[PDB]
Each structure stands twice: as C-alpha cells, then as structure tokens.
C-alpha cells in the first residue's frame, strides 16, 4: 500500500495544521522511501524542525533543507544524491509533491508542494506524491510567501511522521 | 567534489 506521511505545520511557532500526503511507492518506490524515511526520522535525521524556505503564491512551497537550514542543503537517505527514478507521473495540479533538484539525477531531500499545475517541470522533476488531506493548510501557508519567494513568517515542519 | 543547490524554476514567459 502507498505509504501516508504527515507534516504538522507551524507559523512562527504557532501551529497551523496537519498536511497528509500519499507517496506513490507503486510508481517511484526509491523516491517515496526517501521522503517516508526522512519524515519519520528513523535514520537519525530528517524533516522535523525544518522550514519552507521558498514560497511563491500560485506556484509552489519548497522545503526539505534540514542540514544547512538556509535553503542550500539537504541530503537523501542513500548516502549520495540519487537518480531520477522516472518521470511517469506529471505535474497535474495543486497538491502534487515533487523533488527539487540541481539538474538530472541530483535528488536529495528538497521538495516542493505545487499550488497550481506546473507542467513545464514535467520530465525535469520527479513527481512522487500528492496532498491527501489539509490542502487548505498549504493554501494558508502559501499566503506567507511572496513573488520573490522569501517568507514573511517562519513556516516550519513542527512534527512529521508516517501514518497508519 | 562540490554539488549544486536544489531548486525549482518558475515558468519561462
């Protein structure tokens, strides 16, 4: 069964709400597994406490740098950036979860949650999940972004994990 | 060995 993970979002430390994701392990198991493991913290590092460093309303919310906490870091569970597993799934609309990268085969930990259809990213970024519940939290988050991407309040993953 | 910063680009206009 495709795994479910959650983020508990906070805004300058004030809880906003829980966002739940389906991870498409049936299509991109290696990419799903990375994100699942980073969400549970089981390897002794991961997303908890990290922030969404770049939010552009009408485009996406980007996060996942738990190593430098400045948008320049992140790391996979595989000891090295990992391969683009496939581009079977497309950026079809709001709620898609996709990997940020530095060009082909450079997947780490950074990701984005789309707030619109982003079809120009098809074939460049690996789509691996989708918001299941709490898209309205992502819409609320999105309001703290700006056209240039800097956030006006600190948007954090206060807790995260895998759901039964 | 130095690797690149993960990013995602806005649509080209």
Numbering used by the authors:
A (entry chain A): 2 to 165
B (entry chain B): 48 to 60
From the paper:
To gain atomic insight into the interaction of α‐syn with CypA, we crystallized the complex of CypA with the α‐synPreNAC peptide. Within this structure, residues V48–K60 of α‐synPreNAC are tightly bound to the shallow substrate‐binding pocket of CypA. The complex structure revealed a contact between the side chain of A53 of α‐synPreNAC and the carbon tail of Q111, as well as hydrogen bonding between the carbonyl group of V55 of α‐syn and the R55 guanidino side chain group of CypA. Furthermore, the hydrophobic CypA residues F60, M61, and F113 surround the side chain of V55. Further stabilization of the complex is provided by an intermolecular contact between the side‐chain carbons of K58 and the CypA‐residue W121. In the structure of the PreNAC/CypA complex, the side chain of A53 is intimately involved in the binding interface. The PD‐associated mutation A53E introduces a negative charge into this binding interface and sterically clashes with CypA residues. Indeed, the A53E mutation weakens the interaction of the PreNAC region with CypA and shifts the binding process from the slow to the intermediate exchange regime. An unperturbed interaction profile is consistent with the structure of the PreNAC/CypA complex: the two α‐syn residues H50 and G51 are positioned at the end of the binding pocket of CypA, where mutations are expected to only weakly affect complex formation. The high‐resolution structure of PreNAC in complex with CypA can therefore provide a novel entry point for the modulation of α‐syn‐induced neurotoxicity in neurodegenerative disorders.
